[PDB]
Structure 1
């Protein structure tokens, strides 16, 4: 019954948006084999996914 709930959740994606695009710059373009630089960046965006689990109940009253 709120509007900020869905709004905030959307802002969280904004961060991953730039992070995903940056992953390509860290790898160059033809990554795949030994591209750890791409994994380091993705790790940051991965954290946002783990937090969403907790924030879910924080915004969703049981």
Structure 2
């Protein structure tokens, strides 16, 4: 929440955002073989989330 650092926080905001739509759309009726298979797609938000947690430490003051 400084001024230029917080700008990086928003960057990750879109990463998890697109994952929401791309998720419901992905299985919207294109191809389904296994649950774990598609799980790799949602994992994108899982990883970015882990770092997104500490990313706030250097960005804002939790």
TM-score by length of 1: 0.61
Larger relative contact order (Cα-Cα within 8 Å, sequence gap ≥ 6): 2
Unaligned runs of 5+ in 2: none
CA drift at 1:42:
1.7
| Matched residues, number | 62
> Could you say what the CA RMSD is over the residues aligned between the two structures, in angstroms?
3.4
Unaligned runs of 5+ in 1: none
TM-score by length of 2: 0.61
Matches within 5 A, 1:28-39: 28=28, 35-36=35-36, 38-39=38-39
